Amino acid sequence: PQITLWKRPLVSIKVGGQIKEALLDTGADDTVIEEIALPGRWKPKMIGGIGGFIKVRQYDQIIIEICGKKAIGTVLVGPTPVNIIGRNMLTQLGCTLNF
Amino acid sequence: PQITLWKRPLVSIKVGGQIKEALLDTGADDTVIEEIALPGRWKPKMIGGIGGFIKVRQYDQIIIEICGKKAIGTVLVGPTPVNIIGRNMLTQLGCTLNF
Numbered sequence A, B: 001p002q003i004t005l006w007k008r009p010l011v012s013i014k015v016g017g018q019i020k021e022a023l024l025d026t027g028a029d030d031t032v033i034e035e036i037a038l039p040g041r042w043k044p045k046m047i048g049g050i051g052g053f054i055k056v057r058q059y060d061q062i063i064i065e066i067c068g069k070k071a072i073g074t075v076l077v078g079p080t081p082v083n084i085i086g087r088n089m090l091t092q093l094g095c096t097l098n099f
């Protein structure tokens, strides 16, 4: 489909067995989610937002349902205000910006 | 045009009589540019995100240009690591998200 930007592009997602609200974010390289339990070993990571950097746990090959679709990739977990679907996941969905 | 997200969706914009590079951000409610001279009076504003909050100057009635298309609205000026074109401007350009 086509999503307009008159309001925040919020969608429902399923990650780590839970349903959540997330933001389709072309301004994010990564997909980051509030504290949640994911399987496997993680790696440390720094991501720089508008107010500076923070540390998050990096899990790889994590499954996520988004827009009746599935994306399997890197998911960062940390103290984020909003759950974010970054470009690494958006590209798996075949998202493009059009204007 | 149609922009893919394999890499950051950076584009050239014409703002404040200046040509700058900025990121088309569907996750940003607002548009914020690094230090730049703009006409009119401003009001202080705090915007937050990953990493915390920063202080910015809010200018209204600012015109910007991206790929031959123009839009007018509010532009925030402050210490941002990357220039962000938010939804307040993306809508005016007829920018949508497709998949």
Ligand SMILES: Cc1c(O)cccc1C(=O)N[C@@H](CSc1ccccc1)[C@H](O)CN1C[C@H]2CCCC[C@H]2C[C@H]1C(=O)NC(C)(C)C
Pocket: A025, A026, A027, A028, A029, A030, A031, A032, A047, A048, A049, A050, A080, A081, A082, A084, A086, B023, B025, B027, B028, B029, B030, B031, B032, B047, B048, B049, B050, B081, B082, B084, B086
């Ligand atoms: C989450 C993330 C990554 O994993 C990797 C790179 C950047 C980001 C990141 O924070 N990107 C942001 C743009 S600010 C930005 C900073 C550096 C580079 C590019 C953009 C988000 O797209 C938008 N971001 C989405 C969201 C992040 C959690 C807090 C609530 C909003 C805040 C909003 C935001 O920051 N809005 C402003 C108006 C202050 C610009």
